[PDB]
Amino acid sequence: ATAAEIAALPRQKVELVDPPFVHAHSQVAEGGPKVVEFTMVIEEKKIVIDDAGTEVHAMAFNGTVPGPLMVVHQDDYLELTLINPETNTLMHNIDFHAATGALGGGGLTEINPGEKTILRFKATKPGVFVYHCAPPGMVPWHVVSGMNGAIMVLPREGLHDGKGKALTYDKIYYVGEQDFYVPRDENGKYKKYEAPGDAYEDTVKVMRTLTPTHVVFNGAVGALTGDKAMTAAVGEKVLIVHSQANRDTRPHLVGGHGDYVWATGKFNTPPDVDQETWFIPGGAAGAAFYTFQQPGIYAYVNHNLIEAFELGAAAHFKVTGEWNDDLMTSVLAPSG
Amino acid sequence: ATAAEIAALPRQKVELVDPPFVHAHSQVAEGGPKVVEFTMVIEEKKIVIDDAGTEVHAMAFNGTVPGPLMVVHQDDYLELTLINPETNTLMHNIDFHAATGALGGGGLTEINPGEKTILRFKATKPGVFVYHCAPPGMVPWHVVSGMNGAIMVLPREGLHDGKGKALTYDKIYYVGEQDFYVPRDENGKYKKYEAPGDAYEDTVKVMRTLTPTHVVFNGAVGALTGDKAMTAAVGEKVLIVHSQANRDTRPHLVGGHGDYVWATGKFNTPPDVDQETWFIPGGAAGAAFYTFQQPGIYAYVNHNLIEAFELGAAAHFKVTGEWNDDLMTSVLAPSG
Amino acid sequence: ATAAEIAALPRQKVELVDPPFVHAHSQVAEGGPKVVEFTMVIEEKKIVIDDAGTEVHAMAFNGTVPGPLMVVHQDDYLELTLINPETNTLMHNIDFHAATGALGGGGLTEINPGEKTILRFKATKPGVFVYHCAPPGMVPWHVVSGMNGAIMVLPREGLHDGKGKALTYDKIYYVGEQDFYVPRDENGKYKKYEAPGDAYEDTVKVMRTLTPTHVVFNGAVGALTGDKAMTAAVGEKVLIVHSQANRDTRPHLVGGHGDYVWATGKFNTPPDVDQETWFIPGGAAGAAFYTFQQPGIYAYVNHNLIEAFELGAAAHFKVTGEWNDDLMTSVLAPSG
Numbered sequence A, B, C: 001a002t003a004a005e006i007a008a009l010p011r012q013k014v015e016l017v018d019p020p021f022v023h024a025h026s027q028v029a030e031g032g033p034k035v036v037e038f039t040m041v042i043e044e045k046k047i048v049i050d051d052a053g054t055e056v057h058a059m060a061f062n063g064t065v066p067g068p069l070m071v072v073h074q075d076d077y078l079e080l081t082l083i084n085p086e087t088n089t090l091m092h093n094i095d096f097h098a099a100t101g102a103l104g105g106g107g108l109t110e111i112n113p114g115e116k117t118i119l120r121f122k123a124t125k126p127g128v129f130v131y132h133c134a135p136p137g138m139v140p141w142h143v144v145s146g147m148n149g150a151i152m153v154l155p156r157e158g159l160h161d162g163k164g165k166a167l168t169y170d171k172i173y174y175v176g177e178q179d180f181y182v183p184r185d186e187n188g189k190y191k192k193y194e195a196p197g198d199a200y201e202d203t204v205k206v207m208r209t210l211t212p213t214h215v216v217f218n219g220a221v222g223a224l225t226g227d228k229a230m231t232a233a234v235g236e237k238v239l240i241v242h243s244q245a246n247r248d249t250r251p252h253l254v255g256g257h258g259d260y261v262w263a264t265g266k267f268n269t270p271p272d273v274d275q276e277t278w279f280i281p282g283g284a285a286g287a288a289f290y291t292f293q294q295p296g297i298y299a300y301v302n303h304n305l306i307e308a309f310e311l312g313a314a315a316h317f318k319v320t321g322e323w324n325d326d327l328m329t330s331v332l333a334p335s336g
C-alpha cells in the first residue's frame, strides 16, 4: 500500500481496558483494513505482589502488569502513541513481536522521560503476540519488572479450527504471566528499595540464578481469585490468551481441557486439540479455546505445580450451571 | 445418553499391573461402551531411590511410583475405587486430567486415612493423560512425593497415523518420570525423617529452588536398566507412554527414533514423525511409537543429559535380532 | 540395499566449513543415492567464552564449538572418518541422532587418543538432527564441553511447505547453542585449569545445579556479532538451523519471524507458520525459514532474555536493502 492509500484508510481510536479483560472488538472484521489507534502511558510504580507485602518497582505499560491486550485484524495497521512521562526515570521503548522491522519497533520508539512517539506497523500475520520493552543493554531487567503484554491479530474472518470450521468465543480473557526476581536479605526476607535503580545490582544477581521468587498472573499472587476470579457458565465458549515474555509456562485448566489450543499462538498454524496441559515458550503468547461443561470452581495454573502453588501461578474460574453426572459422578462419597 | 442407558452398560473389573508393564487390553474396542472398574490402595511408605540409600516418604497409588497405567477406550466410563488405609497419616484424593469436572475428580475424592471413595467419569477425549493426587494447599508436595501416574484412553478404532493408516503396537510400556526434592544437611548428606510430615518444611525449601535432587524413571535411579531393562525384538512395534506430572521432560531413544509421536499425548492431534527428541511439558503425558530395526542395548533418556546421567533419568531397552549393515556399519573399527 | 549395491554407489567427498557457514550442497538432490564422505579431527583445546577471559576446556569436533553442519539427502549414506589425535587425553566417540543402531553410532566409534574410525549409516529420515560425543559414564561432561553439532538430511526433492509448495532458501546458517558450567572460586571468579580432567569434579558440581554460568552461540558470548554477524538482504530467503544438545532453547528473530519453522526439526512433520518464538528441546535441532522484508540490524536470541542478555545467547543479522514504510513507520519520532 502507498502512503496515500494508508492515509485514506479509516481510523478507529480504541480505549484500552485492564487485564484480564479485553477491549470491545468484533471477531469477524467489520469492513476493510483500518488504522487502529491506541495510546499507552508508561508508569514506573511500586506494586505489591503478594500477601506479605513484597514490593516491586514495576515498569508498567498503561499502569498495569501485564500491559493491556490490543486487538486488531490481519492487515489492519496498529498505530501506537507511546508516552514516557517526565515523572519516570528510565528510557523505554516497545518491541511488538507482531511487527516487522527495526527490532519489532524497538529501534524507533526509544523515548526518554518527557518524550512520546507514534509507531505504526501493518499486522500482517494473525495470532496472539507478545510485546515488551527492550532498551539496549537493559532488556531483561525491564521485561522482568513487568514491562510486557500481548496483542491479538484476528484473521479477518475470525477464528476457525484446523479443518475450516468457525470457532466463535462468547468471551475472552488475557492472562499475562510474570516471573519476578526479588532480592532477599540475610533472613530470607524480601528487600524494599527507594527507587528502581537501587534494586538493579541485587536483582540481576537473582535473575542470573534463572530461578524466579514469584511467578504470577495479572501482577500478583492470587490476583485472579476471589472477587477477581474469572467467570463462565456451562455451555459458554471462552478463549484464554496467555503470555510469558521471558520464561516458559505450561497452562492447564484443572477440571477442564483446552479443546483447541494454538500453543504457538499463531492462527495459521492448526490448533492442537483435547489438550490437558499446553506449552508456551518464553517470548510468546498462546491461546486456548474451551466450552465449559461442568459448573463449580476451576483452577487455571502453570502446571509445574511448585510454580503454581508455591510461587503464585494459579487463577480460578467460577462457573455457574447444572452438574453433569454422565460426565462425572461420585458413586460413593468419602466414607469409612 | 438416557439414565437407563448408562445404568445398562456392562461393568468390567480389571486387574492392574505395576509399571512399566500395562494390564491386558485390546487396541480396538471390544464391544460398545463399558464402565471399566479399577481399585487402588494408597500406600505411604519409605522407598530408597539411589545407590547411596537416599530415602523418600513416597505417597503411592497402588503402592508404586508412578501409579499404574489404566487403559480404557473413548466414551467408556472409568470407575475408580480409591482406598486410603487407616495406617496412612495424610488425606489424599485424585485428579484425572482425562476427566471433566470437580478439579478432575479431586473435589469429590478427598479421603482421610480409614476412608474410601468411588469416582466415575466418562472418558470423552482420546489420549494419554496424567492423574495425580491434589489435596488443596499441599498439591505439589503430594505430586513430587510420587503420587501420580497416567491413563490411556484409546480411540475405539485403535491408533492411526496422520494419514489414517492403522498403527498397531506389539507391546506397550509406561515410563513415569519423577522429580524428587530431597533435603540435605549442611554436610551435603540427604536427610532421613521418621514421618512424612516431618520433612514438609525442609522439602518445600528444596522445591522452591525448582532444582530436583533426583529425576528418575519408575521411582529410582537405574530402575529400568540392567536386569530390568525393557525389551523388544527387531521388527517389533512398541508404544512408549511417558508422563511427568510436575516438570518438563524431553524423551529420546538413543540409537532409535519416535516414528510417530503424539507429543501432546492427544490422539486427535496428528502425531509428529521421525522424531529424535520429543517434548512433554510438566503436567502431561505423551506417547511414542517405534518399530525397532537394530538389535542391541538402547538407552532411553530425558535428553537434558545432566538430568539423565547425573540425576537418574536413564532407562535401557535390550533388543534381540539380526544386525542391519545397510542401516549402519563400522567400515573401520577403532584402530591406531 | 545389499553390500554390493552400496559398493556400487557413487561417492562424494565433502569439505566442511566452520559454523555458522554451511558447506556447499544442493537443496534438490543431484542424482541418485551416494555415499557422502566427511572427515573430522577431534581437538581438545582451550576456548575463551566471555570478555572476562573465562576459559572452557572444549572437546571440539573439527576444532569448533559447535562441530560443523554436515548436509546429505534422505537415503544417501553418511560415511564419517573420525580422528582422535595422540595429542588429546580422552577417549571420544560420536552419536548421530539421525542414525539407527548402536546408540547412534556411539557404540561403534569409541576411539582412544591415537585412533581413528570410519562409520557409515543410511540417512533414512529427513530433517536436522543433533550429533554429539557420548562416552559411557561421562556423557554430559563431553556434551557440555562443546562436543556436539548437527547434520541436515534434506528431502531428495528439497524443502516444501505444509501444502507441498517448494521452499528454496538463498542462504543457510547454522547456530549451535551451548550451555556451559564453569566452576567459580570463593570470590566468584571463574577458575582456570591446565588439563581437561583437572576440572571434571568442579564442573560436575556446577552441572548438577542445572544452572549454566553461560549460554552462548558458536562457543562464546558475542561470537555471532560484529565481524561475525550473519548477513542477508531484503527479499532473501534464509534458513536458520539451530541446535542444543543438552538443554532447551526458544529462538526468536528480533524484528522478524519464523515464516515456516520445523520446530521438531523433522521435515516430514509439517512446519508451524508465522512464528514469533519457537521451541527446541535439549537434545534436538530445529530449522526456521524466513524471507527478510526490512533492512537493518536484527538480534537473534534464545528468548529467555536473561539467557540471551545476561548469559550470552544473542547473535546479530545485518540486512541490507530498502526500508518498507508500509510494514512499519515512525509516524512521530521520539520527541518532547
Ligand SMILES: O=N[O-]
Binding pocket: A252, A253, A254, A255, B095, B097, B104, B134
Ligand atoms: O490438574 N492440575 O493440577
Ligand SMILES: O=N[O-]
Binding pocket: B252, B253, B254, B255, C095, C097, C104, C134
Ligand atoms: O542420543 N542420546 O544421548
Ligand SMILES: O=N[O-]
Binding pocket: A095, A097, A104, A134, C252, C253, C254, C255, C301
Ligand atoms: O523480541 N526479542 O526480545
Ligand SMILES: [Cu+2]
Binding pocket: A059, A091, A092, A093, A133, A134, A135, A142, A147
Ligand atoms: Cu522499559
Ligand SMILES: [Cu+2]
Binding pocket: A095, A097, A132, A283, C252, C254
Ligand atoms: Cu522479544
Ligand SMILES: [Cu+2]
Binding pocket: B059, B091, B092, B093, B133, B134, B135, B142, B147
Ligand atoms: Cu496424596
Ligand SMILES: [Cu+2]
Binding pocket: A252, A254, B095, B097, B132, B283
Ligand atoms: Cu494436574
Ligand SMILES: [Cu+2]
Binding pocket: C059, C091, C092, C093, C133, C134, C135, C142, C147
Ligand atoms: Cu568426547
Ligand SMILES: [Cu+2]
Binding pocket: B252, B254, B303, C095, C097, C132, C283
Ligand atoms: Cu543424544
